[PDB]
Amino acid sequence: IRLQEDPDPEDENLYEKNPDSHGYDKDPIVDLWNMRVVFFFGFSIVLVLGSTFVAYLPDYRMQEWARREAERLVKYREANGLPLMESNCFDPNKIQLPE
Amino acid sequence: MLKIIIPTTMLLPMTWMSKHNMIWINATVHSLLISLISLSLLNQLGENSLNFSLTFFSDSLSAPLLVLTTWLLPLMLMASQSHLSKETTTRKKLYITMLILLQLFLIMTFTATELILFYILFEATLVPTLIIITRWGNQTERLNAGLYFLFYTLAGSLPLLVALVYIQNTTGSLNFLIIHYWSHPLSNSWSNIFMWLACIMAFMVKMPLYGLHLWLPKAHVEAPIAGSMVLAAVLLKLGGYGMMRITTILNPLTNYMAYPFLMLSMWGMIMTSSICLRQTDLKSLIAYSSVSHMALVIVAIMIQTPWSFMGATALMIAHGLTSSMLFCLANTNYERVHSRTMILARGLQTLLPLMATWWLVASLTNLALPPSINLIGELFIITASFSWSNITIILMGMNMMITALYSLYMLITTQRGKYTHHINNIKPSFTRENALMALHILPLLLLTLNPKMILGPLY
Amino acid sequence: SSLLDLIWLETILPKTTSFIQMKMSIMVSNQKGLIKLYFLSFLITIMISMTLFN
Amino acid sequence: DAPPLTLEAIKDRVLYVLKLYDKIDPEKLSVNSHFMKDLGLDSLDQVEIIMAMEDEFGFEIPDIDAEKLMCPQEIVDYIADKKDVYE
Amino acid sequence: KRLFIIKPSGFYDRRFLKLMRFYILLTGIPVAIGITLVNVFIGEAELADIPEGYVPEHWEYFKHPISRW
Amino acid sequence: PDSWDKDVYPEPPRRTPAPAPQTSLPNPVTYLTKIFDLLVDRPVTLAREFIEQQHAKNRYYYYHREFRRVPDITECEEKDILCMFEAEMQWRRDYKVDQEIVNIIQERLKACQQREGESYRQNCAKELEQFTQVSKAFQDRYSDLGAHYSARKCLAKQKQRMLAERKAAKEAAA
Amino acid sequence: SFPKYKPSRLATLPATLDPAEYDISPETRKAQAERLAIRSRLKREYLLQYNDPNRLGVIEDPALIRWTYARSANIYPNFRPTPKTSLLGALFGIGPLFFWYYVFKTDRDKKEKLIQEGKLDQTFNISY
Amino acid sequence: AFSAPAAYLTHQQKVLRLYKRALRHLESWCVHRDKYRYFACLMRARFDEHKNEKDMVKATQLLRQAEEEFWYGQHPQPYIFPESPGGTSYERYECYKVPEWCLDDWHPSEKAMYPDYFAKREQWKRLRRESWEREVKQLQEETPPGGPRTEALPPARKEGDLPPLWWHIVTRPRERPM
Amino acid sequence: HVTKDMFPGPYPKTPEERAAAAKKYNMRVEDYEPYPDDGMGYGDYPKLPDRS
Numbered sequence A: 001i002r003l004q005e006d007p008d009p010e011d012e013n014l015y016e017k018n019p020d021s022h023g024y025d026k027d028p029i030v031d032l033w034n035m036r037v038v039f040f041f042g043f044s045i046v047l048v049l050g051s052t053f054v055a056y057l058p059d060y061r062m063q064e065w066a067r068r069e070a071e072r073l074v075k076y077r078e079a080n081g082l083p084l085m086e087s088n089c090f091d092p093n094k095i096q097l098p099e
Numbered sequence B: 001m002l003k004i005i006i007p008t009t010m011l012l013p014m015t016w017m018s019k020h021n022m023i024w025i026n027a028t029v030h031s032l033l034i035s036l037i038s039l040s041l042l043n044q045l046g047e048n049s050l051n052f053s054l055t056f057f058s059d060s061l062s063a064p065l066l067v068l069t070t071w072l073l074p075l076m077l078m079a080s081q082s083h084l085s086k087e088t089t090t091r092k093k094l095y096i097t098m099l100i101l102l103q104l105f106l107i108m109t110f111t112a113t114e115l116i117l118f119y120i121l122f123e124a125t126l127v128p129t130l131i132i133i134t135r136w137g138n139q140t141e142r143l144n145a146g147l148y149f150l151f152y153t154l155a156g157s158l159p160l161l162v163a164l165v166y167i168q169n170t171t172g173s174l175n176f177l178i179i180h181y182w183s184h185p186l187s188n189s190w191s192n193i194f195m196w197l198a199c200i201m202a203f204m205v206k207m208p209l210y211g212l213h214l215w216l217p218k219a220h221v222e223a224p225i226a227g228s229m230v231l232a233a234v235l236l237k238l239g240g241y242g243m244m245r246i247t248t249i250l251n252p253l254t255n256y257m258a259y260p261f262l263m264l265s266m267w268g269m270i271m272t273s274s275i276c277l278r279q280t281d282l283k284s285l286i287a288y289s290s291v292s293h294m295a296l297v298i299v300a301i302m303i304q305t306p307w308s309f310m311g312a313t314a315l316m317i318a319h320g321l322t323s324s325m326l327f328c329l330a331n332t333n334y335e336r337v338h339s340r341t342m343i344l345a346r347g348l349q350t351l352l353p354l355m356a357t358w359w360l361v362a363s364l365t366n367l368a369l370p371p372s373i374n375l376i377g378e379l380f381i382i383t384a385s386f387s388w389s390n391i392t393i394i395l396m397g398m399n400m401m402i403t404a405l406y407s408l409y410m411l412i413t414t415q416r417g418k419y420t421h422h423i424n425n426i427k428p429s430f431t432r433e434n435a436l437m438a439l440h441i442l443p444l445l446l447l448t449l450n451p452k453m454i455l456g457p458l459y
Numbered sequence C: 001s002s003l004l005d006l007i008w009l010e011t012i013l014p015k016t017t018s019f020i021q022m023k024m025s026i027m028v029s030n031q032k033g034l035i036k037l038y039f040l041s042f043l044i045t046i047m048i049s050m051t052l053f054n
Numbered sequence D: 001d002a003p004p005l006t007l008e009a010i011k012d013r014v015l016y017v018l019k020l021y022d023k024i025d026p027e028k029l030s031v032n033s034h035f036m037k038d039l040g041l042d043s044l045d046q047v048e049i050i051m052a053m054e055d056e057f058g059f060e061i062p063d064i065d066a067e068k069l070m071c072p073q074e075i076v077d078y079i080a081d082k083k084d085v086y087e
Numbered sequence E: 001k002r003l004f005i006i007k008p009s010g011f012y013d014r015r016f017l018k019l020m021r022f023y024i025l026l027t028g029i030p031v032a033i034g035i036t037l038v039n040v041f042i043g044e045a046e047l048a049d050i051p052e053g054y055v056p057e058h059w060e061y062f063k064h065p066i067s068r069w
Numbered sequence F: 001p002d003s004w005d006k007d008v009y010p011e012p013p014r015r016t017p018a019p020a021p022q023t024s025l026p027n028p029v030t031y032l033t034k035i036f037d038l039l040v041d042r043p044v045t046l047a048r049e050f051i052e053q054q055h056a057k058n059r060y061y062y063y064h065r066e067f068r069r070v071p072d073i074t075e076c077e078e079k080d081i082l083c084m085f086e087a088e089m090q091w092r093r094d095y096k097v098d099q100e101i102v103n104i105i106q107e108r109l110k111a112c113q114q115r116e117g118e119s120y121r122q123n124c125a126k127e128l129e130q131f132t133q134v135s136k137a138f139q140d141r142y143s144d145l146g147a148h149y150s151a152r153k154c155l156a157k158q159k160q161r162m163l164a165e166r167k168a169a170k171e172a173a174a
Numbered sequence G: 001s002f003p004k005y006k007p008s009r010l011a012t013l014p015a016t017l018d019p020a021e022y023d024i025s026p027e028t029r030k031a032q033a034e035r036l037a038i039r040s041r042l043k044r045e046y047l048l049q050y051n052d053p054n055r056l057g058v059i060e061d062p063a064l065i066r067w068t069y070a071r072s073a074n075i076y077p078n079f080r081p082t083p084k085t086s087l088l089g090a091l092f093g094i095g096p097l098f099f100w101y102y103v104f105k106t107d108r109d110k111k112e113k114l115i116q117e118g119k120l121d122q123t124f125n126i127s128y
Numbered sequence H: 001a002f003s004a005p006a007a008y009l010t011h012q013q014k015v016l017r018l019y020k021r022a023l024r025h026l027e028s029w030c031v032h033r034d035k036y037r038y039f040a041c042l043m044r045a046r047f048d049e050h051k052n053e054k055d056m057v058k059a060t061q062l063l064r065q066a067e068e069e070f071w072y073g074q075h076p077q078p079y080i081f082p083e084s085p086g087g088t089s090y091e092r093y094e095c096y097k098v099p100e101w102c103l104d105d106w107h108p109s110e111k112a113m114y115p116d117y118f119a120k121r122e123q124w125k126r127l128r129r130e131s132w133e134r135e136v137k138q139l140q141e142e143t144p145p146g147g148p149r150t151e152a153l154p155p156a157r158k159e160g161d162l163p164p165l166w167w168h169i170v171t172r173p174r175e176r177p178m
Numbered sequence I: 001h002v003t004k005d006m007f008p009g010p011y012p013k014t015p016e017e018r019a020a021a022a023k024k025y026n027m028r029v030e031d032y033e034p035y036p037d038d039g040m041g042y043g044d045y046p047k048l049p050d051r052s
């Protein structure tokens, strides 16, 4: 041997001292409460509440607004015989091309 | 963003002031609360971004990445408390401090509105990661892995700093909004070619590009479980976020300069999948799978179409979740048998049934199974590549076949067959490990239910 | 796995760069600490600076 | 599903097959008789006997093991051990 | 003659699944009941023309009661 | 139903032939329709009547947001950031509305195909030409702008189209 | 007589058809005995550790350790640039890249030429 | 399976293995019992014809030619018993085989559901622990100094001992465990 | 518990090294055979028969 070194310790099993262990801590009470807070907060609060919050987020992306605007535009343009999609994005009168 | 930034900097003193047995409980609970608060960032706009102040802003690209970071912190705490039982209180608190610092840097990285502040934070993420790897890794090779990771990233990113300060001198600003509104075409010249190279090479190294990827297996295999989880799920996505952001000022030169990187990405996607087929180590298999998926994301960014960016965002989020879960599963197996070899532990389905179910679900998401967001992103990238050219479909189909092959090979090897006879210490799965897998996998399926939340700004 | 990842991609960038840096480090630091030698070096430097810099 | 095997049933079936063998005299055949020491058969006869037992019980006896079964009692013990029969 | 079937421990997997079900249904069931009560009694808004001289709010631009809240 | 606009989403009048039975055998479809109306339709209609009664007691309204027009990128001066921002936002909103118009025309096309059934190739010629025109205009406007599209890029594309058309007209008139 | 069997790498030669199986030397018998002795020694070691009532964990396999080490960590130290290695590396690492570059470059050049000449069917191609 | 193999197969062992394999493949060709009986008797006639042969060189050459003939004329799809290595029911019940060490990780409530079984199991565990030293001592006394020359194991020579290295053989999972 | 002397090493060039490699890999000296030293990184790992 080249050193005064400790032997490699045996692996510690959490189920030996505490058969009904959750794997969080050596102390039974701390282990139980760690399980409880993780399950409650994570699953209940974050999963359920965040999923329902995201489901009912207000329509700030303007999908339904854009659909209603498109319906108004289509109704007006087909009533008057105009093309449904304008051929140009901008006004050629406003655009000044080089000679 | 301060309502999310300050609670992290308050996680720090709370961690250092809590009792010796309440550190894990406090850190986990308040990380979950901060994740819930960060869920409010998903209410984005259709026209522009959320310009909170002069320093921070949020977008449809930043918000899912922030949510993923904040959600990943408590999972890392759970895995860490698994493997750090015998540590001293001071060193446990130092580990939690490194994790909290990494999360704070990542938050400010995704929300930084200037390219220079973004650079400072995205380079600041290196120190906690390097400390975590080279200090709390198990094997001898953690030191060499840390050296490889650090020097690859810095060699990539220093020319980026030079290019950024040059662009600030040239145009007067590095603000993302201003450089978006005042962008000009990049003429075909050698100077412009090397500017393009500086920026893109920084982020390609961070991605990684095939051929610049060896640091990834080295670091991901040799890091502790929390280090592996954050390296794959979030730190690989700094490259994608940066490449998406910085390509505003690189057109039309990106049309001509993307050929070498597209060729490298497609062929290396094939090559890394084939490597995965013949890997004797489980962690290396997961790392090379990460490389293949990031190659697909690089292809998406380089072809640079509205359909490719949405696929890139979806694939980045999905890969983060899936790879983190796979690393956690492999780590549970390792904590049983203290070896990373894939054929050592077999019959784990007949020894641990619920973990076999978790393995099945993670491997079903790893390969693109519809309607998962993994498949959604992969399919959008494939469609954009098909519009780019019609042989990209050949390469993409080959990659999908090989991905299914190696994913199911990993599942069958570890879980099926007959158990190793002499491994007589496979204790039943802990509630902590089961809850970790559930918390990884349920958000993925919910994201399948609502997919517009992770499709990026181009949606 | 072997020929490209473990062998040639490793040889091109990181192995060759590390070898070059190690060789140059050995060359720079391999000095006997002789004032005669590095003062002769100073003389050469002074002559070069006087002549080739204008 | 199928009725479990018993030691008596296995013994009855092996002796039944052996009494249906023509080269064995059914009158002097017992459960302890040796195929070659006191029945006068040879190695090929023993091979055929083992194959007949394989067809009788519907499973295979590997050649490494079958070469040693020189007694109906030895065959019974082998088959009971392989089928997990203890009664 | 019944024989003992040697099996791994299912207690821990059963306990985890039971706890997971309890804690999802601890908040999920009240949320489902509340969503049903809101939907049945406080219906969705109906589209209307903006009265002249009246300036609405953003929640008044949204439709579902929960989204407006 | 007054839920949607019949002009925006047209449907032809539904011609349902009257039954003309020629057998004494009872119609199982008719018997089962009667059973379905007794067991399912009546309970669901009662439930909806109760819910709609509860809704009418809590009546409240939501409005459609109105955006006024602002000067566009053609009128905005060079590197005038505020006018550029307003014009860019307006162009983005118009892009969204155009996308939804194309979606409406596609819905018309799909519904007509399914409705006509075995004679769709002839009976849906009106919807096919309308979709062709709308899609061609939409493509010419927003075809190849890229991931980082903007009002400036679309203006450059339109200026290029106008130059090409002017050149072609000059060559034709030559 | 009967047609002969030609072994391949993926359909090997049966032991019963191997000519060396019917030409046995007295040194062949002692080689077989030595191999069996090695196997018996290894089996005894493994079985003792396996049936130990006090053993808990994994019986470490040095052969498995050596295999995994030789497959990954011992490759570069034992790699030398030879003509064969250099040519195989250059081929397998450069040829595919330039082949695919040529294929995609040619395809996209044809596509853009058709686009410019205005004879490519681009109708209904809205999503890109 | 149950028996330790030797360093080599003798000529007689090779001949008998060829005889059994040839009869099995002949039965696979001759599906019907009467046809199989006829051709099996002819096959045994050939073996008995060459049964008495003093020249071992000629005997080995005969065996080699017989092996070549068998390989040429073997059935491409020979009959395999369901539980045999090539069979359809091979290794079907391996996923149902669980070890007794897996049994002892049970929760106390689970173990309380089987009070009588676990008392006998504790008796077996005590019996295993009380004999290990005698087993290892007997193994190390009877081995040659060079080491084990074969895989065979000795019995228990005393009235209170157990055959060394017996636990996993005795307590192996049942063939139809679940 | 594997020592540094029980790992794969470089290609053996002397009969003493071939004997040491054979003993390390639990093989007879007569049966031990490395891969050819073509610089592919095989080292002194044995070349076993290519069967399954």
Ligand SMILES: CCCCCCCCCCCCCCCCCC(=O)OC[C@H](COP(=O)([O-])OCC(O)COP(=O)([O-])OC[C@@H](COC(=O)CCCCCCCCCCCCCCCCC)OC(=O)CCCCCCCCCCCCCCCCC)OC(=O)CCCCCCCCCCCCCCCCC
Pocket (backbone or CB within 6 Å): B012, B013, B016, B017, B088, B089, B090, B091, B094, B097, B101, B127, B128, B131, B135
């Ligand atoms: C505020 C919380 C922290 C936030 C940090 C943010 C950044 C701040 C930087 C400066 C911080 C101040 C200086 C602290 C020095 C501490 C030294 C020490 O002894 O620490 C242990 C000490 C307790 O242990 P001890 O009893 O002294 O026993 C020590 C023995 O060594 C025990 O024996 P042992 O053997 O078990 O211990 C060995 C251990 C002992 O080693 C140590 O303790 C050394 C700790 C690190 C050295 C200091 C570095 C300073 C430079 C800046 C970077 C710091 C980042 C990490 C900060 C760690 C803070 C502890 O060494 C190791 O294990 C070696 C590990 C090697 C790797 C890790 C070390 C380096 C980490 C830093 C590098 C990464 C930086 C990334 C870049 C970004 C930077 C922001 O911890 C403390 O006292 C905690 C300090 C904070 C207390 C709370 C303060 C706030 C109170 C409430 C405020 C409320 C405000 C109002 C709110 C509104 C409502 C009212």
Ligand SMILES: CCCCCCCCCCCCCCCCCC(=O)OC[C@H](COP(=O)([O-])OCC[N+](C)(C)C)OC(=O)CCCCCCCCCCCCCCCCC
Pocket (backbone or CB within 6 Å): E027, E030, E031, E033, E034, E035, E037, E038, E042, E059, E065, E066, E068, E069, F060
């Ligand atoms: C025990 C189980 C059942 C109950 C569960 C707990 C409550 C469930 C949700 C509320 C139920 C109904 C309450 C109505 C209150 C308003 C009455 C009214 O006239 O409103 C008119 C208004 C009309 O909409 P408005 O936008 O025009 O309102 C104008 C502004 N005020 C409100 C001032 C008039 O409707 C609402 O306010 C709708 C509110 C919907 C519910 C909001 C989210 C829930 C808030 C509580 C926290 C989360 C609880 C989730 C469930 C439990 C989780 C653990």
Ligand SMILES: CCCCCCCCCCCCCCCCC[C@@H](O)O[C@H](CO[C@H](O)CCCCCCCCCCCCCCC)COP(=O)(O)OCC[N+](C)(C)C
Pocket (backbone or CB within 6 Å): A046, A047, A050, A051, A052, A054, A055, A056, B039, B064, B067, B068, B071, B317, B443, B446, B447, B449, B450, E064
């Ligand atoms: C025993 C079990 C058997 C298997 C059963 C499960 C398998 C069946 C799955 C199929 C059934 C699905 C049920 C669908 C019910 C309808 C609800 C769903 O459709 O709503 C979704 C809502 O989306 C979901 O909320 C998804 C939320 C995504 C998760 C949010 C994050 C949760 C926090 C965790 C953080 C993780 C971060 C990861 C990176 C972001 C989709 O949006 P939408 O239907 O139109 O909303 C309706 C409300 N409206 C009308 C007002 C609009």
Ligand SMILES: CCCCCCCC/C=C\CCCCCCCC(=O)O[C@H](COC(=O)CCCCCCC/C=C/CCCCCCCC)COP(=O)(O)OCCN
Pocket (backbone or CB within 6 Å): A029, A030, A033, A034, A037, B007, B025, B029, B033, B034, B037, E027
């Ligand atoms: C629909 C949502 C409503 C949910 C409301 C939830 C509010 C909190 C309820 C759950 C708290 C759990 C504990 C509740 C009371 C404690 C019960 C008790 O006495 O047990 C304690 C429990 O102690 C704990 O485990 C500590 C956890 C309780 C404190 C942590 C919760 C504080 C969270 C504050 C939430 C506010 C955040 C809002 C701002 C958002 C910030 C981003 C003793 O256990 P130990 O200390 O571990 O035993 C060892 C002693 N020898």
Ligand SMILES: CCCCCCCC/C=C\CCCCCCCC(=O)O[C@H](COC(=O)CCCCCCC/C=C/CCCCCCCC)COP(=O)(O)OCCN
Pocket (backbone or CB within 6 Å): G083, G084, G087, G088, G091, I038
């Ligand atoms: C259809 C698939 C083709 C694949 C791509 C096409 C490339 C050509 C095919 C391979 C040619 C060489 C590529 C690299 C292969 C290296 C050769 C090699 O491995 O052996 C070298 C020999 O190489 C050399 O040292 C000398 C360099 C050149 C010799 C080999 C290249 C000669 C190729 C012939 C050119 C083509 C001939 C044209 C014929 C008509 C074709 C239309 C070492 O020899 P050994 O020690 O015996 O190791 C082998 C162990 N069994």
Ligand SMILES: *P(=O)(O)OCC(C)(C)[C@H](O)C(=O)NCCC(=O)NCCSC(=O)CCCCCCCCCCCCC
Pocket (backbone or CB within 6 Å): D042, D043, D044, H011, H012, H015, H022, H025, H026, H029, H046, H047, H050, H051, H052, H053, H059, H060, H062, H063, H066, H067, H069, H070, H073, H074, H075
């Ligand atoms: P018991 O211990 O009495 O066994 C006696 C033996 C045979 C061991 C003798 O003592 C002995 O060694 N005799 C001399 C060696 C000898 O028998 N050589 C000849 C053996 S092979 C032989 O000649 C028979 C071959 C003919 C059959 C060939 C089979 C090929 C047909 C296969 C067809 C498969 C599908 C139909």
